[PDB]
């Protein structure tokens, strides 16, 4: 009669590392590192992301004719740009504080695109048909959907002054531009007044713009330049535009609604009808593990990103079949 004390063993080939020894075959263990994703862009808790596609934030907010499909979108869970998001500003120039505008849009859950200055009724004494081949559509010269190029009307450019009172009960993002002719002749032909200026003011914003005329290299086949600006108009405040030339006026503005958890990512993955709580530029993740080595960029509730290739915690004991 014999009684022996022993321990479990099995077929398992699971291995783990320890401080003293590497690749210790063990009976049981648990992986703590998520390395799987579905390779798709999904909805985040039911809400679809905004796919800018061939456009970028600038093209989208200004209304680049190449981004018309985006015009109707009002809500999204996160913003997606692609390696091919090349359609931003179409008329050469500088977009002032663009990175900050992008940061601002990162916490916007939704907005309403509305006419702040109706194309007809806002500028009775100015031409508004200004167009450019730099912003063409259907092989025909066009212009930003949200802005209006004001020009001389019948050899005259009256000093304009238009106001908008924010009665939306929300922040209103207002965008506009300042055009800069390459020479004095053009300035005269387009705006009459040789020494023009543009003034934009609110309760907390105050800026004046002066045309800077000089010959410049052609970009997108234009020597002219357009600088883009923006500001946030607080609920109840009033924005005033005053000019006697060079103003690329606002036509459409955006009443913003703030949210949490959104962000802008860059991905070449496609949108699918899938839902997730965690999205990476490479694909969505469905996991309860504490870590993931899939991607450092995440939207939602995800595992902590680490550069590890393996993180396995032994639970059972050293496996010794003793064969």
């Amino acid at each position: 009669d014999t009684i022996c004390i022993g321990y479990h063993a099995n077929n398992s080939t699971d291995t783990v590392d320890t401080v003293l020894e590497k690749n210790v075959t063990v009976t049981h263990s648990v992986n703590l590192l998520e390395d799987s994703h579905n390779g798709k862009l999904c909805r985040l808790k039911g809400i679809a992301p905004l796919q800018l596609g061939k456009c970028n934030i600038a093209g989208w907010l200004l209304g680049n004719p190449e981004c018309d499909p985006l015009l109707p979108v009002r809500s999204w869970s996160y913003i997606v740009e692609t390696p091919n998001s090349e359609n931003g500003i179409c008329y050469p120039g500088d977009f002032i504080d663009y990175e900050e505008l992008r940061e601002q849009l990162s916490s916007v859950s939704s907005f309403e695109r509305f006419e702040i200055f109706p194309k007809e009724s806002s500028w009775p004494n100015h031409n508004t048909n200004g167009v450019t081949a730099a912003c063409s559509h259907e092989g025909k010269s066009s212009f930003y959907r949200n802005l209006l190029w004001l020009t001389e009307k019948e050899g005259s450019y009256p000093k304009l002054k238009n106001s908008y009172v924010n009665k939306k009960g929300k922040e209103v993002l207002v965008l506009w531009g300042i055009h800069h002719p390459p020479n004095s002749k053009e300035q005269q032909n387009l705006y009459q007044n040789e020494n023009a200026y543009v003034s934009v003011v609110t309760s907390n914003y105050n800026r004046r713009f002066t045309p800077e005329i000089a010959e410049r290299p052609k970009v997108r086949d234009q020597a002219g330049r357009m600088n883009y600006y923006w500001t946030l108009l607080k609920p109840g405040d009033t924005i005033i535009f005053e000019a006697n030339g060079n103003l690329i006026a606002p036509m459409y503005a955006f009443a913003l609604r703030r949210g949490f958890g959104s962000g802008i990512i860059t991905s070449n993955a496609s949108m699918h009808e899938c839902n997730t709580k965690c999205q990476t530029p490479l694909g969505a993740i469905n996991s309860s593990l504490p870590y993931q080595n899939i991607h450092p960029v995440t939207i939602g509730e995800c595992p902590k990103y680490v550069r590890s290739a393996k993180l396995r915690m032994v639970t059972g004991l050293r496996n010794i079949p003793a064969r």
């Binding site: 022993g6 401080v19 939207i299 050293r318």
Partner: protein, 160 residues
């Protein structure tokens, strides 16, 4: 192992025992077989389960984290942001890998210890009614049926 039992004086494991991590064999007259000790095994499960849940609990979820853009004149700011992101990533990667390496060692010694104590626990019972042979094994003197082999498993035996 730290405690000498597993892969120690008790050379190997029993693919035959499938009821738990630690158990007894027993080769009595009414026959032989395997039987796992619920006490120690279950106790080990509660410890290891708590360990794993602790490691996971401490690593609360990562909320939205995305890249940022910087213009051509904000190179220092872009590099600062980069230093921050790489620094936090270095530390978390280091922390995760070390914790797992360190705790895996501890876990193996934990089992080694449980086998060791289970052994000495049976030994202090049999005392003189059997001898220690092939390590881990005890050769009874009075010869005990499958009924007495049980008194040992549950820790009641009694007969110094």
């Amino acid at each position: 192992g730290l405690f000498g039992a597993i892969a120690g004086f008790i050379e190997g494991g029993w693919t035959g025992m499938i009821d738990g991590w630690y158990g007894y064999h027993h080769q009595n007259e009414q026959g032989s077989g395997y039987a796992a000790d619920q006490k120690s095994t279950q106790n080990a499960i509660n410890g290891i389960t708590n360990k794993v849940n602790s490691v996971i609990e401490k690593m609360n979820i990562q909320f939205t984290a995305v890249g940022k853009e910087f213009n051509k004149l904000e190179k220092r700011m872009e590099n600062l942001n980069n230093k921050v992101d790489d620094g936090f990533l270095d530390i978390w990667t280091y922390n995760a890998e070390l914790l797992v390496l360190l705790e895996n060692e501890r876990t193996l010694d934990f089992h080694d210890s449980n086998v060791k104590n289970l052994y000495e626990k049976v030994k202090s019972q049999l005392k003189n009614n059997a001898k220690e042979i092939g390590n881990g094994c005890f050769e009874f003197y009075h010869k005990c049926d499958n009924e007495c082999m049980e008194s040992v498993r549950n820790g009641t035996y009694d007969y110094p």
